[PDB]
Amino acid sequence: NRPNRLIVDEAINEDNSVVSLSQPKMDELQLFRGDTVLLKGKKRREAVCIVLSDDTCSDEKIRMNRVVRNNLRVRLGDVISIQPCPDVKYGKRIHVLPIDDTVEGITGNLFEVYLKPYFLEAYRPIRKGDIFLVRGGMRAVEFKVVETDPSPYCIVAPDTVIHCEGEPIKREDEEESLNEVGYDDIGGCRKQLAQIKEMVELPLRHPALFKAIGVKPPRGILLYGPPGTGKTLIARAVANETGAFAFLINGPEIMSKLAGESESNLRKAFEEAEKNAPAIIFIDELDAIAPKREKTHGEVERRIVSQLLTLMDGLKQRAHVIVMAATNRPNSIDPALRRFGRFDREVDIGIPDATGRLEILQIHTKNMKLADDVDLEQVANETHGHVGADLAALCSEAALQAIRKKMDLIDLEDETIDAEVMNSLAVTMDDFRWALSQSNPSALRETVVEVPQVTWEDIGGLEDVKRELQELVQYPVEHPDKFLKFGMTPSKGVLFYGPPGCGKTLLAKAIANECQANAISIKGPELLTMWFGESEANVREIFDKARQAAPCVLFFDELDSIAKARGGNIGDGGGAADRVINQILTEMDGMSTKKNVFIIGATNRPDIIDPAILRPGRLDQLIYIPLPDEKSRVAILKANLRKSPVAKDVDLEFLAKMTNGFSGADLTEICQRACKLAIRESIESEIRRERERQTNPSAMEVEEDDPVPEIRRDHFEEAMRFARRSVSDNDIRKYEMFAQTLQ
Amino acid sequence: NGPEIMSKLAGESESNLRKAFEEAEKNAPAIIFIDELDAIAPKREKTHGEVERRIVSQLLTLMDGLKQRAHVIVMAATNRPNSIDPALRRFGRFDREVDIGIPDATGRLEILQIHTKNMKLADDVDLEQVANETHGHVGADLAALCSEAALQAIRKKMDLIDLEDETIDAEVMNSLAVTMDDFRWALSQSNPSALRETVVEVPQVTWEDIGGLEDVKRELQELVQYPVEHPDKFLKFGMTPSKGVLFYGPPGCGKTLLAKAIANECQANAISIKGPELLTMWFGESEANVREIFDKARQAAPCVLFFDELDSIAKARGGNIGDGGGAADRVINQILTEMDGMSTKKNVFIIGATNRPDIIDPAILRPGRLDQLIYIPLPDEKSRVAILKANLRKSPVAKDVDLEFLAKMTNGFSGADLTEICQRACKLAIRESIESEIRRERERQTNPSAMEVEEDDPVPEIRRDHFEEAMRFARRSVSDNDIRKYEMFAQTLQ
């Protein structure tokens, strides 16, 4: 609705000093011809200069020299706030000096060769930060701000004095790129970024607006996350977007200096941050300054931790200063800092999922010059355990092997052709596959949080189980009003039991997928690790994480692992009590339903699970997953072969008909054996025909007809010739007895 | 400020601490506050160095030089008592201690009031309901919750106003208010900073929450109520109070629901400890913590210290046969020691509970200890009526359903089973309501009837149908063999 809130679009006058008009808009403005109009955009950098060299284009979209997009803006679709501010002072003059592309060739004076013919009767109505193109030649070189005799911008005049003693730069350009980093650059963490924005942007932009209510803003934020996730870029991008100041503190850099000099820098940091407008302080590798005091032994260490604490306690809320710190884990710093008034809010970064890795590949892949076969999606999905720095390494590896293996006899010779052939250079899928061959991910041990994609199309039947699940997880998160009306206490668990590998792990994920909620899976080996290692404190981390990421279906399978470890039902002299079970019970008893975190369990031998966990306030529910009946195996098969070709001579319904009861993994084994037979037959036929072509000197005999690009009935018939009923009837009867009489 | 003192140089640290007391002595009756004493005088086993002890010594000597003629008093803040050098916890030094604790439902209400003064609330804001459902919070979490709700209101309401710079912002802040949904959302994303600490407060459960047990009530009132009112009778007849009682019977028949009751009738605090803590101190082999509980029980008196699942450790090493050993362990020994080293004149009571009494060490039933055994039996006629009325008092109910009929149909049941029946009925009601609502919504959607008003909940309450469906799947959670075994345990108390 703001009248001067209008889009900006393409421009044709290669000189940036021109700014457009829109006569219907000029009638709205007081836009006068002369020196300058203040056209305001983002990050406070503007493109202020002479005006009215436009009205060639349509209205509602101001024509602004494209070079004022990289500056003052980012892309199209933006909006300008054009408001005149002509008649600026006439100081001495504005800086003259190039930046990047002038040392390449004759330099002379850098003013009187190429740039002099442009400050003619248009004597630079400018604003420091306006960047453009000006030359007396190839017509592509920048003109940047270096000096400032008058603080505000002016209109130059002859007879002045200029010193091109300055040198064109390039490292300065990299620094400018750091300033340039913005929301689109950082990728792979969307949900996390939204919280930081809603936390820091609103207090910053309008301080008095948030102060009027007077509620407390946050003083410090602590970011978790393994290395390489990208945390410096987040802080720099936030600072760039809020147009505020910044200050960086490196822990190792602080610790290197002398004992006496260590505190001076840390005091100066806060002092400088206090002398400016709303600013943000960043500390990287906090563990190097304030680790757990049990490890540290000395005098300087505590004498610096105390300084950090006292400085953090002297803000007073009237300075509009906020601090963010980077640390690997929460249980890695002195708990003194994790207190109110000190660091009190925490945000975890995590590990990018399949969606985020696609964004990271995109931001990195800009100069790749890819081919059609490059399927970035397939590349991203098969990238388990990588982080924001491993992907860059993978891209570099693929690119450099392309360079070498292709120009194995070109790049070795010195000649400009190298650059030329770089234009001819490209990248193929095989390069990416090969590079993925030698990729050692830096994180394959960390607990995984994400939304599994498994849908019930992946498992056919279990209708009543579907209904019960939707009752237990779906309905509560939609209509709490019904619980309020009838005063109801949600149930917080459910227990499974039945034969082995009948899809239990394939159901929990399913509900999460229908709930769009994350999921976490923990198996028996971890239970054995914390048993033998006798470290059950880890059980507090899992739950803690489950609390941060909610909702989650925390799934425990092979619950009977520890029970069977000390024998079966008879077991040892003891009963059915252990340590990890006690910690599980404690955490369950100390959890609030109002965070919507669900717990699921699984086991094959339910007779050897402690009954101490089936009382109210706990699972208190038992569900039995039976052997698949008719046409459930049909859906299982369709899921199995949906990634492999199949002919029509084979009918999955026939395979289902032949079997009279089977487990879940056995059908997968049958399909895999059929695939193995197909692969062997194809390879053998191909090699035999290749040998025929070799021994026979038929220099030209073209024949490309794969005898088996698919699968036939024969493969499945041979598979049927060797198969198992993996479960005996005695187990079925035992489960029937376990059903008891449910009166 | 402790950290402020520690930051300075070694030489400069003592000058400030001397100047503090010097200035305090130059004025009229004054008070000195030390925050985070742990930063200056921690347990010396942790500290290794020279400056640390050279400052603890200065603190002690300064503390010993008051002379009582200056009218100067000092208070210090510390997280726990076993966190400072015991030198300071001596006579002439710090000798009096006061525990702040964790605010209960009543206190959190006051904190909400003091914080909520510019909130500009609406009618629906029920601060009471907000306060009661605030377990585990402290004096700083409530401020954070207030801020979260306020700012969420600011954003979600002025999502297209506050983003534009204009004085109207302040003006719309006048139009700004807060709704209950904002508080509920804030409570959704609230992580309390204290959910593991022992709780001390007066439970509100009354005997209206459990109907029968007349003789049990009389004996309770004899054991806990009467002594705290007429010690003169004990003096006259020269009587020694009994300091314990033991329970035994089937599972979950209200044992936990009785101890609190007596506390409620006595307006005295209560503390509950369960088997998982016993297993934690067994496996962890840290029974010293057993001295903390009692210590706290001494500070907050009277208290009915309740131990349930006492047979947990007994069953852990098997049942009656168990292991080669008998019925002796470590935590039981510490319990016996602390009971033997306690004075009745502080009025602290101890209660126990268990389901399998045959596997509890008889070493604790001798005089000077519980020495009393009580059996809570299966509820008889109309006790289940009271338990039902307690169960559904937070839910609407129609008149077609008669709780007396439900009691009549059953011929003996546990305590939690009736709760399960009520919960299943509530689940059926919720499912039926949701299904009917969604079906009618789909009818309204598929039919382009732009205006068809009908607000008649088919079930804003519960009907019998739900209860007969519940009856169609119910369990007697306890078998008759257990009843006979308890009968044998009754033995012949000639």
Numbering used by the authors:
A (entry chain A): 21 to 763
B (entry chain F): 270 to 763
The study reports:
In eukaryotes p97, also known as valosin-containing protein (VCP), or Cdc48 in S. Cerevisiae, is one of the most conserved and abundant AAA (ATPases associated with a variety of cellular activities) family member. In fact, p97/Cdc48 acts as an unfoldase that couples the extraction of proteins from membranes and complexes to ATP hydrolysis. p97/Cdc48 is classified as type II AAA ATPase, as each protomer contains two consecutive ATPase modules and assembles to a homohexamer with a two stacked rings architecture. The NTDs are essential for the recruitment of most cofactors, as well as for substrate binding, whereas the ATPase domains regulate ATP binding and hydrolysis, controlling cofactors binding and substrate processing.
We generated three mutants of the human p97: F266A (D1), F539A (D2) and the double mutant F266A F539A (D1 & D2). To structurally study the effects of the D1/D2 mutations on p97 we used single particle cryo-EM on both the single (F266A, D1) and the double (F266A F539A, D1-D2) mutated proteins and obtained 3D reconstitutions at 2.7 Å and 3.4 Å, respectively. Overall, in both structures the D1 ring highly resembles the conformation of wild type p97 bound to ATPγS. The D2 rings aligned with the ADP conformation. (E) The D2 ring pore loop 1 (P545-N558) of p97 F266A and p97 F266A F539A double mutant also resemble the ADP state, as evident from the pore dimension and the interactions between neighboring subunits constituting the pore. The strong structural similarity of these mutants is in line with the similar effect they had on the growth rates, pQC capacity and UN binding affinity. Three conclusions may be deduced from these findings: (1) The D1 (F266A) mutation is dominant over the D2 (F539) mutation and thus imposes on the double mutant the same conformation as was determined for the F266A mutant. This conclusion is in line with the very minor phenotype both the F266A mutation and the double mutation (F266A F539A) had on the functionality of these mutants in cells, as well as the lack of significant effect when substituting the wild type CDC48 in yeast. (2) In accordance with the all-“up” conformation of the NTDs, the affinity toward UN of these mutants (F266A and F266A F539A) in the absence of ATP resembled that of the wild type p97 in the presence of ATPγS.
